[PDB]
Design an enzyme around this catalytic site. Structure first.
Site, PDB file in Angstrom:
ATOM      1  N   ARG A 156      11.819  -8.810  -5.658  1.00 41.55           N
ATOM      2  CA  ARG A 156      12.844  -8.498  -4.684  1.00 41.55           C
ATOM      3  C   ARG A 156      13.621  -7.238  -5.075  1.00 41.55           C
ATOM      4  O   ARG A 156      14.627  -6.914  -4.427  1.00 41.55           O
ATOM      5  CB  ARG A 156      13.794  -9.692  -4.468  1.00 41.55           C
ATOM      6  CG  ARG A 156      13.669 -10.392  -3.104  1.00 41.55           C
ATOM      7  CD  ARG A 156      14.131  -9.459  -1.945  1.00 41.55           C
ATOM      8  NE  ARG A 156      14.342 -10.110  -0.648  1.00 41.55           N
ATOM      9  CZ  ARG A 156      15.254 -11.054  -0.445  1.00 41.55           C
ATOM     10  NH1 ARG A 156      15.984 -11.415  -1.501  1.00 41.55           N
ATOM     11  NH2 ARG A 156      15.427 -11.629   0.770  1.00 41.55           N
TER      12      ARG A 156
ATOM     13  N   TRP B  71      17.024  -3.018  -6.523  1.00 43.08           N
ATOM     14  CA  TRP B  71      16.423  -1.887  -5.789  1.00 43.08           C
ATOM     15  C   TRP B  71      17.419  -0.749  -5.795  1.00 43.08           C
ATOM     16  O   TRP B  71      18.430  -0.800  -5.089  1.00 43.08           O
ATOM     17  CB  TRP B  71      16.199  -2.236  -4.303  1.00 43.08           C
ATOM     18  CG  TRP B  71      15.203  -1.317  -3.580  1.00 43.08           C
ATOM     19  CD1 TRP B  71      14.961   0.000  -3.839  1.00 43.08           C
ATOM     20  CD2 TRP B  71      14.311  -1.676  -2.513  1.00 43.08           C
ATOM     21  NE1 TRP B  71      13.971   0.476  -3.013  1.00 43.08           N
ATOM     22  CE2 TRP B  71      13.551  -0.537  -2.198  1.00 43.08           C
ATOM     23  CE3 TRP B  71      14.065  -2.851  -1.805  1.00 43.08           C
ATOM     24  CZ2 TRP B  71      12.582  -0.539  -1.211  1.00 43.08           C
ATOM     25  CZ3 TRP B  71      13.101  -2.845  -0.825  1.00 43.08           C
ATOM     26  CH2 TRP B  71      12.374  -1.700  -0.537  1.00 43.08           C
TER      27      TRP B  71
ATOM     28  N   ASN C 201      24.374  -9.865  -4.104  1.00 44.47           N
ATOM     29  CA  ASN C 201      23.142  -9.570  -3.422  1.00 44.47           C
ATOM     30  C   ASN C 201      23.687  -9.201  -2.103  1.00 44.47           C
ATOM     31  O   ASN C 201      24.199 -10.073  -1.388  1.00 44.47           O
ATOM     32  CB  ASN C 201      22.393 -10.840  -3.099  1.00 44.47           C
ATOM     33  CG  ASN C 201      21.023 -10.886  -3.635  1.00 44.47           C
ATOM     34  OD1 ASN C 201      20.650 -10.159  -4.562  1.00 44.47           O
ATOM     35  ND2 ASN C 201      20.244 -11.797  -3.073  1.00 44.47           N
ATOM     36  N   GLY C 202      23.597  -7.945  -1.733  1.00 44.79           N
ATOM     37  CA  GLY C 202      23.974  -7.639  -0.383  1.00 44.79           C
ATOM     38  C   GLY C 202      24.729  -6.379  -0.187  1.00 44.79           C
ATOM     39  O   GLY C 202      24.644  -5.439  -0.984  1.00 44.79           O
TER      40      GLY C 202
ATOM     41  N   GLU D  74      -2.680  -0.496   9.828  1.00 39.22           N
ATOM     42  CA  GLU D  74      -2.321  -1.381   8.715  1.00 39.22           C
ATOM     43  C   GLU D  74      -2.941  -0.874   7.435  1.00 39.22           C
ATOM     44  O   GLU D  74      -2.242  -0.449   6.521  1.00 39.22           O
ATOM     45  CB  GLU D  74      -2.850  -2.797   8.963  1.00 39.22           C
ATOM     46  CG  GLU D  74      -1.854  -3.898   8.703  1.00 39.22           C
ATOM     47  CD  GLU D  74      -1.108  -3.573   7.455  1.00 39.22           C
ATOM     48  OE1 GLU D  74      -0.483  -2.500   7.516  1.00 39.22           O
ATOM     49  OE2 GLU D  74      -1.197  -4.307   6.439  1.00 39.22           O
TER      50      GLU D  74
ATOM     51  N   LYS E 190      -1.180  -0.153   3.728  1.00 35.00           N
ATOM     52  CA  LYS E 190      -1.620  -0.598   2.424  1.00 35.00           C
ATOM     53  C   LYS E 190      -2.036   0.589   1.542  1.00 35.00           C
ATOM     54  O   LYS E 190      -1.195   1.209   0.895  1.00 35.00           O
ATOM     55  CB  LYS E 190      -2.723  -1.606   2.571  1.00 35.00           C
ATOM     56  CG  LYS E 190      -2.259  -2.780   3.426  1.00 35.00           C
ATOM     57  CD  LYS E 190      -1.210  -3.635   2.807  1.00 35.00           C
ATOM     58  CE  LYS E 190      -0.272  -4.135   3.860  1.00 35.00           C
ATOM     59  NZ  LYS E 190       1.012  -3.402   3.559  1.00 35.00           N
TER      60      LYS E 190
ATOM     61  N   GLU F 265       0.455   2.677   0.344  1.00 37.58           N
ATOM     62  CA  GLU F 265       1.536   2.118  -0.501  1.00 37.58           C
ATOM     63  C   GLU F 265       1.075   1.718  -1.894  1.00 37.58           C
ATOM     64  O   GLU F 265       1.733   2.019  -2.893  1.00 37.58           O
ATOM     65  CB  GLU F 265       2.147   0.890   0.201  1.00 37.58           C
ATOM     66  CG  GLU F 265       3.065  -0.047  -0.577  1.00 37.58           C
ATOM     67  CD  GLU F 265       3.511  -1.221   0.298  1.00 37.58           C
ATOM     68  OE1 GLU F 265       2.650  -2.023   0.725  1.00 37.58           O
ATOM     69  OE2 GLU F 265       4.720  -1.333   0.593  1.00 37.58           O
TER      70      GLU F 265
HETATM   71  O1  LIG Z   1       3.296  -2.926   3.038  1.00 35.20           O
HETATM   72  C1  LIG Z   1       4.429  -3.372   2.906  1.00 35.20           C
HETATM   73  C2  LIG Z   1       4.743  -4.541   3.916  1.00 35.20           C
HETATM   74  O2  LIG Z   1       3.973  -4.111   5.044  1.00 35.20           O
HETATM   75  C3  LIG Z   1       6.177  -4.355   4.272  1.00 35.20           C
HETATM   76  O3  LIG Z   1       6.332  -3.083   4.975  1.00 35.20           O
HETATM   77  C4  LIG Z   1       6.811  -5.314   5.219  1.00 35.20           C
HETATM   78  O4  LIG Z   1       5.993  -5.740   6.246  1.00 35.20           O
HETATM   79  C5  LIG Z   1       8.031  -4.692   5.923  1.00 35.20           C
HETATM   80  O5  LIG Z   1       9.044  -4.198   5.167  1.00 35.20           O
HETATM   81  C6  LIG Z   1       8.545  -5.796   6.762  1.00 35.20           C
HETATM   82  O6  LIG Z   1       9.523  -6.727   6.273  1.00 35.20           O
HETATM   83  P1  LIG Z   1       9.317  -8.284   6.811  1.00 35.20           P
HETATM   84  O7  LIG Z   1       7.939  -8.574   7.220  1.00 35.20           O
HETATM   85  O8  LIG Z   1       9.402  -9.289   5.702  1.00 35.20           O
HETATM   86  O9  LIG Z   1      10.423  -8.586   7.676  1.00 35.20           O
END
Ligand SMILES: O=C[C@H](O)[C@@H](O)[C@H](O)[C@H](O)COP(=O)(O)O
Ligand SMILES: O=C[C@H](O)[C@@H](O)[C@H](O)[C@H](O)COP(=O)(O)O
Lengths: 608, 608
Positions: free
Chosen positions: A26, A74, A98-99, A481, A485, A488
């Protein structure tokens, strides 16, 4: 992000550092715990880096205490990372949250007024000096807090502690989740029930607003006003396997390979009798679902791509006008509500800033009603929705979503058939969708058994630093998609283009050394595609093409064909996703990358 | 693409080669003319390359004749380029067309049957042996043709010739435009009135279907059946300056710098009295425009980006639900028609395959009615539309659209205010839009006077091969655009991301050597943006930021700020486009690229 909190009789550090490790996803820039021993000796500690960077700065200087609070992060807006790292020690008040504290300014100024001195830039260090000021004005901590909370704006999940009295920890929940783990003689606070997974397994999940007062021998929870509350307490489930990568070298890979069972979960208790079942919505869904004339879909990153694939289905199958916008834009933009519009967020976390305000917005813009396709239960998206459908993915640890994707497809796909039928359409539409669904698992099984081959391809990308992903149709976005990936988890500059867009420009990029990943089933758009393949082909572009076994493609030094097991077509975009997932993972290994926490990132973005 | 045709008494080659040169943009892979001298000596000639590759293969072997037909090309599907190059010499029938012959198979087989022998792969060489077969069956050429035409399916623009009788040229028009240039004693055929611009200036623009019979001393046109026709004949205008780059080293650059006057044209006779005027639609527009509830927008490449920018306006200003899809996907996809939907193509050519079928589709899917925002008059999109608004751009020669973009914005922007008012909204909305419009010219003027500075930046991209373009809002797509440019005219891998999407993945690409172009006015989304700038910033990313003079940004080795002259905001996306255009052009020079015909491309994609 990740925030942990012990308060037992044993030493609480090697747990605090564990909690963190199990919230490194996280957040993975900065870390650090704060414990205190009996006597009262505080012992704050911060390190830039993985949690391990801390770990090691603990072995060097073991921390004794039975009252500590840790925290990973982060580091987004950057900033002196070890200075702006949690926890922050306001003289005797230590905090970790957290926040986001909104009014983190109207406060920082006001206090400061009162001779306060923020040696560091940060909103945490504001919680402290705030709670502290409130000690001075009478009451006990569990009182100084219950007064300071309501003077903060944002969504946070702080866990305040008094170095002068480690007898009690305070925990508030205003947005970011905070669950409490119950031990024997001991307690634990957490942002997620996964930190604590080692020690307890008995959690009282804080409702939203609670300011729980915690000691070793008690856990008193108070509502927002200050009343006493009796929050139930349940035993965990989220432990199937916890955060144990098992046989698998990384979480993605395990998460990738869980897709086949992961869908089964989703198709479970829903494919009741040749036809999708979603009663789980309670007979009041066919009264809002039925008035539905248009569907708006909010999302980010992979959670958006799915939204895409679907749009194709909601229309070519449900016959329903549907938009699928990126949450980030939507939320800040004046817009025009279609008549009779079912809003539909597609988070996996349920806690994403944007897809959630989005939702929130939706409420005011008179939509017909919300629907929520989360992975995580009782998630902010899921509870502020109106309807909700859960992926049954299982917890996904990978920073790079994978099974959360495939699940989403499956769900949406199911919603389509519901809506399809719900609209007197062809009873054959549902049938067909189901057959896919009700055979997706077995099929992805099929697909994974190609690992080796794809693993082979990835070798060819060592030297590359660009990649083009092409698809057309309800696979434009599947090609979206697999870029996201690879892009990333290996840092390769991968880009996805709807096949028929090449000649209008981008097609200039192609050349001798530009690989081009292309997905191609026995679609009707096959030949269209077969073309732009030949168009790139004819200009150098090295071509890796994932094409149905019966496509017609032919091997060649310039054109690499990877046979695909004939799939259905209703579930075709899911299927063709998988191989693209393998490839990103494998290229990532060849690349030597943080397959599970890619840089500058961190699973679920819940900041804002 | 480009197809030229002489038939005079002088030698017609150094014209044929000129016609080509002035259609090199429409196509620049292969070329070649065919003339014949008095006696009858054919003299076909083909060369891979620029038209000049031919030119030179002409000087070496001068071609005498007063009957020739030339032709440039876009070699798309690749193929033995000099074998599959026009013209093709079927024994004595020489052909050259522009377009696509659909049934190019049900024919190629059938003929072939009759001992025919296609030594080359191609649809042109099918026209030939087809027309030829028709000689054998009686009649004269102007008869053998009028019979073969109707047995072809597609959209084409062939110009057939009989090497045994260069006395006559035949020209048919089934789709691709063919205009006839009238000379003295001589005639000329062309795909565009720009080839012939040197010789004649008097054109009879073939209607759609015509099979004109042409000789030196006559030009008889027949309708589809075979009737005789009296096509009028007009003098050209499209000659403002023709294809003379003037002071300007390339067409883009001139076309870029024409934007300021180019808009003026567009805002001309439309900004009648503090409020946009578009009567040009004839009082029957407020009866379809008014029932409008939703707007679908078809497009490709830059013509799409514009569609984007607009969507923001049609909603946040007109309050009208609007989609803006990529033509390539739309056309092949079953979809759901909103109620009361004005379809709206946004071609510049008017002749783009996809945006046009799209349109065509639209017709069947019960939309409310078409609207056409073309650059070119009497264009396939413009005549099959229902309403149409012309950019008044002037002819754009650049392969990479620029002024066609800015014009489009301006138009759409105008339509918004019409629709705005048309919807009893705030009379202030129109006012505001207009003020922008009615001051866009002067302002872009302002912007260009920054050439030098941007020209300076571009130096920093010599060594780069990636680039990220970020924007948020009605500038998400402006950042889309400037990528597409740079991406196309310099080959740099530029990518555009909606600012708030970074953290969900792509943000992994950033690093020490990744430039990031960002556009940032005094928007309300300023700070949001100001952030993701700081997010990238904090991770290496070298940052070139085009920000309003009063943004607040601050210079820095890692963060390059390029002050922007305060603009309005209604026209903000247009303005901020320009600098991005300069930068792509300048980087292209530093790169040493075909600023005007980038590889694998060719202005307007009209194939299919
Ligand atoms: O490759 C990384 C994931 O694709 C990531 O990008 C995620 O899908 C988004 O940040 C969405 O967040 P949530 O799906 O959890 O809301
Ligand atoms: O950078 C290239 C131009 O952006 C080019 O992509 C053009 O916009 C499309 O091919 C659209 O064609 P039309 O605008 O002419 O229809």
């Amino acid at each position: 992000c990740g925030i942990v909190g012990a308060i037992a009789q044993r030493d609480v550090a090697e747990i605090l550092l564990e909690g963190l490790r199990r919230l490194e996803y996280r957040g993975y820039d900065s870390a650090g715990l704060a414990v205190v021993d009996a006597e009262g000796h505080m012992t704050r500690l911060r390190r830039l880096g993985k949690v391990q960077m801390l770990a090691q700065a603990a072995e060097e200087h073991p921390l004794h205490g039975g009252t500590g609070i840790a925290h990973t992060r982060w580091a987004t807006h950057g900033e002196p990372s070890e200075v702006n790292a949690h926890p922050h020690v306001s003289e005797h008040i230590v905090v970790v949250h957290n926040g986001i504290i909104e009014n983190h300014e109207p406060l920082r100024e006001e206090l400061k007024a009162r001779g306060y001195t923020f040696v560091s830039e940060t909103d945490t260090e504001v919680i402290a000096h705030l709670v502290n000021w409130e000690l001075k004005q009478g009451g006990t901590l569990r009182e100084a807090v219950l007064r300071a909370i309501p003077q903060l704006r944002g969504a946070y999940g702080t866990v305040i502690m008094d170095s002068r009295h480690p007898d009690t920890l305070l925990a508030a929940r205003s947005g970011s989740p905070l669950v409490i783990g119950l031990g024997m003689g001991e307690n634990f606070i957490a942002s997620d029930q996964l930190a604590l997974l080692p020690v307890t397994r008995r959690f009282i999940f804080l409702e939203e607003g609670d300011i729980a007062e915690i000691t070793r021998r008690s856990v008193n929870i108070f509502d927002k006003t200050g009343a006493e509350v009796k929050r139930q307490d349940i035993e965990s489930n989220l432990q199937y396997d916890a955060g144990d990568k098992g046989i698998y070298r990384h979480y993605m890979q395990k998460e990738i390979y869980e897709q086949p069972n992961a869908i089964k979960n989703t198709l479970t208790g829903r494919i009741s009798h040749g036809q999708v079942d979603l009663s789980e919505l309670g007979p009041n869904a066919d009264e809002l679902l039925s008035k539905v004339e248009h569907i708006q879909i909010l999302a980010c990153g992979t959670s958006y791509n799915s939204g895409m694939v679907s749009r194709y289905w909601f229309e070519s199958l449900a016959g329903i006008p549907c938009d699928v916008e990126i949450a980030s834009e939507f939320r800040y933009r004046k817009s025009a509500v279609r008549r009779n519009s079912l809003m539909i967020t597609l988070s996996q976390s349920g806690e994403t800033a944007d897809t959630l305000a989005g939702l929130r917005l939706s409420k005011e813009l008179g939509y017909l009603g919300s629907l929520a396709i989360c992975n995580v239960p009782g998630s902010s998206l899921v509870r502020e929705s109106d309807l909700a459908l859960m992926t049954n993915a299982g917890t996904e640890i990978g920073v790079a979503s994978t099974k959360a994707f495939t699940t989403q497809l499956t769900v949406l796909l199911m919603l389509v058939a519901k809506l399809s039928k719900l609209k007197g359409l062809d009873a054959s539409i549902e049938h067909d969708i189901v057959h896919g669904l009700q055979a997706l698992p077995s099929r992805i099984e099929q697909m994974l058994s190609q690992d080796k081959r794809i693993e082979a391809l990835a070798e060819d990308f060592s030297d590359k630093h660009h990649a083009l992903f092409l698809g057309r149709g309800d696979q434009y976005p599947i090609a979206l998609e697999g870029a996201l990936k690879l892009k990333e988890i290996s840092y390769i500059h991968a880009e996805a283009y709807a096949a028929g867009e090449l000649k209008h420009g981008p097609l200039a990029l192609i050349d001798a050394d530009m690989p081009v990943i292309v997905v191609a089933p026995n679609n009707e758009l096959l030949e269209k595609l077969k073309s732009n393949i030949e168009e790139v082909r004819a200009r150098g572009g090295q071509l890796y093409v994932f094409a149905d076994q019966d496509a017609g493609f032919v091997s060649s030094d310039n054109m690499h064909i990877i046979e695909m097991p004939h799939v259905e077509e209703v579930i075709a975009p899911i299927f063709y996703t998988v191989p693209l997932q393998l490839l990103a993972y494998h290229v990532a290994l060849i690349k030597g990358t943080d397959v599970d926490q890619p840089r500058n990132l961190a699973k679920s973005v819940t900041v804002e």
